[model samples]
Target: WTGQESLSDSDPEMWELLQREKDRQCRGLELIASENFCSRAALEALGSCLNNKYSEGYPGKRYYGGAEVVDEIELLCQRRALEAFDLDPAQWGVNVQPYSGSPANLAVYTALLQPHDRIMGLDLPDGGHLTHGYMSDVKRISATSIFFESMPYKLNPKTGLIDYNQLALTARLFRPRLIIAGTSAYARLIDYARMREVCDEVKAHLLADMAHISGLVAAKVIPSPFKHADIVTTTTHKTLRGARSGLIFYRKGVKAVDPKTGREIPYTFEDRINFAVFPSLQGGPHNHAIAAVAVALKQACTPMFREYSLQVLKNARAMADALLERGYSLVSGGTDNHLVLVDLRPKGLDGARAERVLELVSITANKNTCPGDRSAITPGGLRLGAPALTSRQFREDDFRRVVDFIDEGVNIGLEVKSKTAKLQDFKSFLLKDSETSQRLANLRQRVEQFARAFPMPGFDEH
Candidate 1:
């Protein structure tokens, strides 16, 4: 459903492109780690009649009368959520309806801390997200959010690995009430236990914003923070291969410390979190989303998920290594996880230019900030993942081709530009025929073939 546009104005070409997207998703190798094609069961649940229900309040306690069915779906999601992540049922609570990652973060802050309370998050220009104190709207949850203290390390001018010790020192000094540790574009694995120790030392509430790596963690291909974090917030769609929704989990009965009196607080961490998500922040829950989340969680619990997770990391590592060997600069030298940051500055390409050029090749990726990137939002790096490829069950060889494509595209663009003086001149002197376009089309077709093997949920065409 096009929410803002009229049906008459709907471009058939766009729909055709959408069909291409379906084919692309079904056929091509998806390298975006933060994205995955959900299973058909989850997709069906997300697209089913549950959207019609307005589920306000917790399960079995909704203000709406016909929420009995909604309760069952939500309950199933909660149960699976517990099992899939090995979440502590007693100490943790699950909120499967935050709409998205950012809102879920806000819900955490609202439940755990009061207004004006100081919080800390990873700096955005270096693999951090807005919910981690980059956004004013999101940070407004408290009076002041202390976003300073870069990290345990500096970006390798040559390699991109972050320094955790630096993070520890700064976190100790800042002494924020909340410390969020996670990144959207980082290509390395986070030390969840280390982050927890930092937060614990500072007496801060540790919220591991595992939105990007939730699926990886669940699949056990990467480290998980559920065993360490006081609260874990994740979006289901990414690596988890679930619906587009948010899920918040925390261990049960985590003690809350009072800053003023240094006394123990009432209401365990679980209770406060539940209140924050329901009565405190959101009103009605998205039942359909909840159902999809439940299905996704169940899928995550399967043995196949482990293999998928491992493949994701393996592909990412292969792709990262390929980029480096080809003389390209990687943000952290390489990746230990399912994502990679490609810096375009050495080739005199800004993120904007790279984004457009890659689009020309039907290769999609998001622009991100590298370590030395002066611009926070629009920097010179392209962040891509391997989760989509993993969803398609791609292995190392598939990723090798994907990396080669990137190298070729960049080199081709440079060759064309260097050989010509003007756009028309380039068209005639370099890209005289449709060779480049045809190559890109063929690439897209090949990608579509990969995507087809995965068969993403809710996909009717591919």
Candidate 2:
């Protein structure tokens, strides 16, 4: 059931690697904020015969011939995506293409802005995404940087929360052509209304990247940006429990009056965005991915999905409290969403060591940069989330055990730190320590035992 039996016979090397990965996914804990386990139906749709098609345009107007079925699937996906998010088709249009989030975002800029047009996004180190104008600390330009002039805003220094007033002030002064309202690691609710006001004042397009919170928004557990944002973009995998793809929800036919030049820009809503995604950015849409996205969006609209979304938040808060009780410093003091950003500096630990140590204990998480982090490789924080755990039907108590595993791993790392004063490389020192290695092995066994009880979603087959 891992794959075709022929696959095993024809390519034993690749099949063995797949089997190993299946085992790892089954036994290991996935805490990566951006990762999630997709539904079986979604996976089936992904592997379906729809992948054979090469539909180069939207439904009803494709350049290719064998697009009759592909058109219907694309239309269905667009409809379901809007319905799942409770958006009005009268006001909003949905595009279920552009490969993934990065290109989808790129399509947005290509649709609306000119070369060197000003754009504002949250700072990368402060939880914003790289596509959202993340530049090197030394002011080096990136892919996004070359196309447009980039300006970044930071979270409040003290509370690690977005400063709306400061953001508004910067937006007014900068007068950017586009203002992105979203984050990659932020744990607080974004005030879409306030962001809309800033965009309105400067006539900037409001693009809300809800890649991380799309499921929570679909469940209505969090505020929806459809009411305020001119365009909303998300990846279907994270939090949405869907295929790995990108989606765009936007208003059509609404032209903007440029604040600086007093000129009315013609191309406004869905037309500009759609054109950008198709001819400007991508050629043929992945019909299979579209079908898979449709399946997930349908699943996301159900009552059970709502409960799952709520539980994701519940487990996050529970884990945050458990970590805090153990004296860990959480950014924003706690989380308002599924992810938690834990500062390891107080424990005399770096995120790289903590992430590696947790991996040794079969707990998977990513190292993240805290605010003002100088190094991207080995940062000051670990980003943890509950979506994958919640998918396995893990409750608050189970996450408490996860917290225990993480705590034990970090403590072991700190203990190893004291002995390796002369040792420059922390990873080698921790790996070489007999006591810490033994402790990690013991923890890995316990984690595997716990993993078996919960059973990963979609791994029921042998």
Candidate 3:
């Protein structure tokens, strides 16, 4: 569909449903590390008339008419994205197209590698993302794995950390065409320079998937991937706190850093990547999202957002510290970034139980496949993040309270687990037994009491 007209009446049912969801968020706390509260400015553009346009190509090079203004929006977005990262336009070119992180990442693969070309990424169970070529022994878990030959690198169970020494050997032996440098749940900073050298050793392209840490990179709270990667991609809705869209930055200068030796060489990623995004993959760049991304980038380039980024880190550490003090084992012992993963195996529970039970009390986090898990579906860890609460003006002390709520929720989950063998039965018990339900109800009252104290970031206008 190209666009829609909106002189129409609103659906009361849907409006009520949306209000309920807004109330749900306003009444509870979201701890899912990958989630955040995007600003109203970004949300406004998402609801703007720009969505009515179908500009199916790059700015200044559209296949459709009436794209002049959208072109400006996209160009403005690209410029802001580069500026947010402090990149020189001569050295880098930005593509503010591809729908989201997965699509954006696939576009990079399409541009550089052919079907069945070998690639390397961190293993999903070891904290990597699905788009990074997730594959099982036989069945393909992701399209990247289906089309490309996928070999994954893993974190050590002993240290819960990557062994770059092993990665270099693996890349040398496997000779993958591309290597991805990113993690969805890992909490430590990556040695990009080391990864760059490994890629150089194998003559491979290095793609940095900074989808989770884009805000940190933007605020200079963490190291920049631009200095080390041939290509970089991120989703705008995470720590970046924007509309649900993506951005890609590629090396475009006449001179580039040599991976093996520090020297200059010509790079050519601009045309190929832009073409890969437009005619090759997506039909039209979402005009509305482009403008929203511009708003987000502009907001990111401010002192408040910088403090927000740093606060996100502090909140995560506080939560981790709280969890550790409670004797809960963390995935990497602690966190260095926005999220903390707690191994709930010791509590005789799984993340599915923890996630569902916690949700019953209005604390939202996700079941994650941590290091010790055998299967991803019933993994023994919960991945919690600080971005949403930090966006709610939460400080370290507030995060400690969030952890305390989580502690109560998990303890309740344990009690429920003792009574019921299956998670489905736990829900049944909640529905059937008033006594068990009362416990979560009390917890919910407390959580909601704490939640409504903070003002919701945006409005509920239709």
Candidate 4:
């Protein structure tokens, strides 16, 4: 769907296009909220020959031979993740390797839920990912993924904020085995404390999927969910700026539930979490990814990381404000985190069309549903963020410039009145004006220049 395949299978023209695309990134402005180019060090570890090895069990107990060093690397990573996220090494269990975000979520469910358990999550249009409860597979795996009545607790249409009262009400009624408090598209820090109360009231597990903002939380730019959720899962890469893999952590000292009564029967929380992560669910971990996670975690623990984390929030707020100042509507009316959801409906543009226009300009973003919006996937809104660009050292100054580019690119020519409006004018503008193309080219050049300037934490030489 993304037109991405192997370099070997691609046509020469496609390769040229791809090269131009890469060069464009190297030179241009990027405002993708969910993306960030990894450090060269992180990338190196990911592409290491370790990808070839397939150990089928956890460290120190791998089914494969020659896993002695691999075990050390994985154990080190697990310990580092504990420190980075402020969990107890003696109590909390860290699963440093899940192939990606969704797998980690599934693994969480596998560990905490049964075949007929109920699960409640943010609605798809409100901010949930497909893997949460939107897909049939989510329901198929359980008795049913009871999408607790969302209409009552829908995020404020004007402010795009979650309604805690309704969430509590839904939790009480559904008695979900898992009450998910994370999202892929929503912009704003979650009220994990409130989520914890709701979970406690319902006797449900609070699983905060901080996959989108784990890095920020670790750096203390945003508050940590560890104190709030029974289980917190995140991808190490996004804001944490680590290896492209998933990490799962559970709080220490949680009491276990009585199977017969479906109530807290009292047990070691950390022990249950450890048992759930290993042997019960995932098998051997990715030793290569583990090494990369360890390095990233180490980098995250420094004071420098605090500055980067704060910049992510500042840049996102800048873009959201710039977009709003230019007369575009924002989902939350603004942002308090490292992401902004642009409600393209006010621009007379739909989410899908806006994404295409932005892509033509060599800027990348994803289509997302506005809070409480009932529009199907294609027509809702655009989601953008600052993680990737900030990773490349883009500050508030560059963020406003990129916002201007998107504003001009999106508002090109006459007014857009419908979702189905053809982008003939937008397309022609990209192809006809060599100056616009050059501007895009310049943006990519700037990006690459910055990328090279700030190579990564460990390798200034590269």
The candidate that wins on TM-score is 3
**Comparing 1 and 2 on lDDT, the stronger one:** 2
Cα displacement (angstroms), candidate 4, residue 33, comes to 2.2
User: Model 2: which residue pairs collide?
Assistant: none
Model 4, range 133-154, lDDT digits (tens) per residue? 6544334332124322122235
Candidate 3 C-alpha lDDT tens digits along 125-229? 888999998877778999999889889988988788877889998888899989999989888888899999999889999999998999999999989988899
Model 1 residue 380 lDDT score? 75
Give RMSD to native, each candidate. Answer: 5.3, 3.3, 2.9, 6.0
lDDT (10s digit) by residue, model 2, range 1-462: 665457658778887887787778778888988888888888889987888788998888888786777888898998999999998677678889879888888988888898899989998888889898866667756578888899998889788888888988888788898999999898888989999988888888899999999999999999998878878899999999998899888886435778999987753667788999987889878888999999999999999999999999999999999999998998888999999999998878889878888988788998888776686676889999899889989999999988988888888878877776533566787677787778788999998888867766654442
TM-score winner between candidates 2 and 4: 2
lDDT of 1 at 210: 88
- Tell me how candidate 2 scores on lDDT: 0.86
Model 2 spans with C-alpha error above 4 angstroms: 1-5, 137-141, 253-267, 373-377, 422-424, 459-462
Deviation in angstroms for 49 in model 1? 1.8
Which parts of model 1 have CA positions greater than 4 angstroms off? 1-21, 27-29, 135-159, 254-267, 346-348, 375-378, 417-458
Candidate 3 residue 30 Cα shift, in angstroms, is 0.2
**TM-score result, candidate 3:** 0.95
